[PDB]
Write a protein that binds this ligand. Structure first.
Ligand SMILES: Nc1nc2c(ncn2[C@@H]2O[C@H](COP(=O)(O)O)[C@@H](O)[C@H]2O)c(=O)[nH]1
Length: 903
């Protein structure tokens, strides 16, 4: 096995790298890199090494690493361009792993942890670590074990040990429900005092120094804390030991925040899972609380409990510890069905960057490219700083607030990267410039066609249609690769079927599984020798096909990500290959392509229906368009259908048959008009929506930009049993709306889209009546005290006070007769409730810690003085009104003269 690295780091004039050797052993190296740089030489040179612009370069070998840093500084000062990879780590890696990679993973020490601390006020400061760490869970990927560090004695109450068996019991058995398979994994360890707890943990670390490091919110909390705490009581001199190279760097951040430090641990690759998820989930979420995610992601949730989180140890150490183990597991479980860490491995291993650098598109891509060129003796530019310049972005049509029964949408595949490829946009393919007319004129083909030999953008640009641009040819490769791997992933799957089937008519003695590539399909030759196999040789044979199917796809996905992040790096100033023009070129082209096809579509359609100027294109956003089908349907009469579904196929066919070919054919025009290099602008149908047929429902309706809801039957061809609801921007998600109301509005909406006014009305009446009898929490509002709590503290209020913060002060004011039981409110997430007129608390609203009940000393008073109507209105009716207005509907039946009569 050809080795591979784990981590790299530059300290002084040397590279420090933990890597696995030939026979899988974690070793440490200190190499004094002799980095080489470049400078432009006069034409009359015997050289290879030419930049992306052709100009010749000569190599400059440095001997000593900081010499090169000096050198660079120098050239710049003079005015001379200094070329090459200014980042040496990356230089090293290419230079040392000059081959495709092949990494293991079972040989990579991913440590996953979560620490816990107790505090009167729910949150301690990672910055100063005043409070003792009381619990630490550390799952080790290599050992596949959970190490638990438990603090028996604390000034916040000493406690009893913990029971593995009680942890095992069911909910009703006063048990914690920790899953069996995990139970014999746990390695509990209790401790008297903190000094020992830490001490030991420290030793555990140096003994099993981690490579990747995860957790949930580990980076912003867990890590900074562990770090400081130890520093505080044992001195930084020793805290540094967390670095396998004992080098460390603190760094402060800001915002409303201010002193939010982050410690970079030299030697290890922190990869907070909250980010890891944020970036690759492909699913936009409203909150990132570990509960909510593990709930949607895995259905289960978080260990439920009584009382505030600052009490749980003091009030139920058994569960306190149990919950830690649960948490760490959650993540483990998520990474299993999502493979995020692995993916990270793959990605970084491809590009040859520090793993964490995965988070940065800039670093990632810069590397790739550098490598590509590197093997063709070309030289990369040099990072030039540029000013931030507010260029145009995606196009979003302003919709007409109304109801739209039948609707269907289409998607531009990949867009930005496709555009790049179509126009052949590159820093070194820039041909010229041209007199540019108002964009509007271009999307109408009114403006006169620019260059007769250049690929252009509507902003005035023109690029050569000859030389293949560094960037487009680069993307292309990746885009080819995904096609390649998606291919494999699919082969080992349908090949996986072949094995699963021949296992029912198993065994024909004692044999050997075979040397077969699993990436491609089988061949009758091997399809036969297979029937002849045993349940021992097969099965094992299956594992191999099952594992290559996982690999192939984990690689395929990798590509998908690259492609998406690319525009984001071009649009970024630190990008070595940045250029505002290229940037504005892309975005404006997109901007046009859309409204151009918008025109084309309306054009085509109202001609096919024999109508005039009717605009079907209802809305558009970035890469998608939403057409109105209302007309088409009425044309062939609603009654001519005998089945909700029956229509869907019709629209579907119409799309793929009439529409799509028209679209592409009308898109070709544009390609010639701008006279680009290839066609690449493809759009395919995707959603199809409308009310159930017979149902007096409305299908969909829009409130405004990015604010709409639709009843969907078909999506990208795959049909639905029950209609699904694509809700967008309409606050059924906004974490601020009461959990009760969120389900309530969702229903109203469904009742609108599928049933119609009549249905909606009766519901409104129901939840309205029952509203009063519900649990307060579910109907309370939620916001976060952005700690601007300071900004006011006149002990009392003081103008410009947001309603939010208004209630907080009135809480703390009345909290005065504390008893310690009232959990102090500290700069983070709250509840808030109305409060009728003349209430004895003063002010006219209260708020308290999220996820906590309210201290009985006042709780009942509060409830008594709740302003239900005010509540109802601001939280439920107002957002509701918004919807009804747009859809021309009424949620309250007005006077029918037939009232007063008894039918
Ligand atoms: N081709 C190329 N090599 C670079 C660049 N910056 C640094 N290098 C160094 O050039 C040397 C290798 O060239 P090769 O061995 O492939 O002919 C290595 O020391 C490599 O790290 C760059 O922009 N292009």
């Amino acid at each position: 096995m050809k080795e591979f690295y784990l981590t790299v780091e530059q300290i002084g004039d040397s590279i420090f790298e933990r890597y696995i050797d030939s026979n899988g052993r974690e070793r440490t190296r200190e190499v004094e890199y002799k980095p080489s740089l470049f400078a432009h030489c006069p034409e009359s040179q015997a050289t290879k090494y030419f930049d992306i612009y052709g100009k010749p370069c000569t190599r400059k070998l440095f001997a000593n690493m900081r010499d090169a840093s000096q050198w660079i500084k120098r050239m710049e000062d003079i005015g001379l361009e200094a070329l090459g990879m200014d980042d040496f780590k990356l230089a090293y890696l290419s230079d040392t792993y000059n081959y495709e990679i092949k990494y293991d993973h079972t040989k990579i020490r991913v440590a996953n942890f979560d620490i816990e601390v107790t505090s009167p006020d729910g949150f301690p400061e990672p910055s100063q670590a005043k409070h003792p760490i009381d619990a630490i869970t550390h799952y080790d990927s290599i050992d596949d074990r959970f190490y638990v560090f438990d603090l028996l004695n604390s000034p916040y109450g000493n406690v009893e040990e913990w029971s593995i068996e009680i942890a095992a019991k069911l909910q009703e058995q006063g048990g914690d429900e920790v899953p069996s398979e995990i139970i014999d994994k746990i390695i509990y360890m209790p401790f008297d005092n903190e000094k020992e707890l830490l001490m030991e943990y420290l030793n555990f670390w140096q003994q099993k120094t981690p490579v990747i490091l995860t957790g949930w919110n580990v980076e912003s909390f867990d890590i900074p804390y562990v770090y400081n705490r130890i520093k505080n009581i044992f001195g930084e001199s020793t805290a540094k030991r967390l670095s396998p190279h004992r080098k460390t760097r603190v760094k402060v951040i800001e915002n409303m925040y201010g002193s939010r430090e982050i410690i970079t641990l030299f030697g290890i690759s922190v990869l907070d899972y909250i980010d890891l998820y944020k970036k690759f989930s492909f699913t936009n979420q409203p909150s990132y609380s570990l509960d909510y995610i593990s709930e949607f992601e895995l259905n289960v949730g978080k260990l439920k409990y009584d009382g505030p989180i600052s009490k749980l140890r003091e009030s139920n150490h058994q569960r306190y510890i149990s919950y830690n183990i649960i948490d760490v597991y959650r993540v483990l479980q998520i990474d299993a069905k999502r493979q995020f860490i692995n993916l990270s491995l793959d990605m970084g291993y491809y590009a040859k960057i520090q793993i964490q650098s995965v988070f940065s598109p800039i670093k990632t891509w810069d590397a790739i490219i550098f490598n590509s060129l590197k093997e063709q003796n070309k030289v990369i530019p040099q990072g030039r700083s540029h000013p931030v310049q507010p260029y145009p972005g995606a196009f979003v049509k302003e919709p007409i607030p109304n109801r739209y029964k039948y609707v269907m949408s289409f998607d531009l595949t990949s867009l930005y990267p496709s555009i790049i490829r179509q126009v052949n946009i590159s820093p070194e393919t820039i041909a010229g410039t041209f007199k540019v007319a108002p964009l509007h004129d271009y999307i109408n083909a009114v403006a006169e066609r620019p260059s007769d030999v250049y690929s252009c953008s509507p902003n005035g640009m023109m690029y050569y249609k000859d030389r293949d641009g560094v960037v487009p040819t680069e993307i292309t490769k990746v885009f080819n690769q995904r096609k390649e791997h998606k291919g494999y992933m699919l082969a080992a799957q349908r090949n996986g079927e072949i094995i699963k089937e021949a296992l029912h008519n198993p065994n024909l003695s004692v044999d050997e599984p075979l040397d077969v590539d699993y990436r491609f399909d089988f061949s009758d030759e091997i399809k036969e020798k297979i029937k002849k196999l045993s349940a021992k040789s097969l099965n094992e044979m299956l594992f191999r096909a099952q594992r290559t199917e996982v690999a192939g796809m984990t690689a395929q996905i990798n590509r998908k990500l690259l492609i998406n992040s690319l525009y984001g790096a071009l649009g970024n100033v630190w990008f070595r290959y940045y250029d505002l023009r290229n940037a504005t070129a892309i975005t404006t082209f997109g901007q046009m392509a859309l409204q151009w096809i918008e025109r084309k579509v309306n054009e085509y359609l109202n001609e096919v229906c024999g109508t005039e100027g009717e605009a079907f294109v209802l809305y558009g956003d970035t890469d998608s368009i939403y057409v109105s089908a209302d007309k088409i349907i009425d044309k062939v009469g609603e009654s001519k259908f005998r089945d909700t579904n029956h229509w869907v196929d019709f629209l579907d066919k119409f799309a793929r048959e009439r529409m799509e070919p028209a679209i592409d054919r009308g898109f070709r025009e544009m390609c010639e008009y701008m006279n680009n290099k290839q066609h690449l602008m493809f759009m395919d149908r995707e959603a199809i929506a409308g009310p159930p047929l017979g149902s007096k429902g409305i299908g969909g309706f829009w409130t405004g930009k990015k604010r709409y809801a639709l009843n969907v039957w078909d999506m990208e061809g795959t049909r639905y049993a029950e209609p699904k609801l694509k809700i967008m921007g309409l606050e059924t998600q906004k974490s601020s709306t009461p959990k009760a109301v969120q389900k309530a509005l969702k229903e109203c909406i469904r009742r609108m889209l599928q049933e119609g006014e009549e249905s909606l009305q009766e519901y409104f009446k129901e939840f309205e009546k029952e509203f009063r009898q519900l649990n307060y929490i579910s109907i309370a509002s939620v916001s976060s005290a952005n700690n601007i709590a300071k900004y006011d503290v006149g002990g009392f209020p003081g103008p410009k006070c947001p309603f939010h913060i208004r209630g907080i002060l009135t809480y703390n004011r009345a909290i005065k007769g504390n008893i310690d039981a009232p959990q102090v409110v500290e700069g983070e997430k709250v509840y808030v409730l109305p409060l009728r007129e003349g209430n004895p608390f003063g002010d006219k609203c209260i708020a308290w810690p999220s996820g906590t009940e309210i201290t009985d000393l006042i709780k009942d008073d509060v409830l008594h003085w709740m302003d239900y109507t005010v509540l109802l209105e601001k939280t439920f009716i107002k957002p509701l009104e918004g919807f009804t207005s747009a859809a021309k509907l009424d949620y309250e039946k007005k006077a029918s003269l037939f009232d007063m009569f008894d039918f």
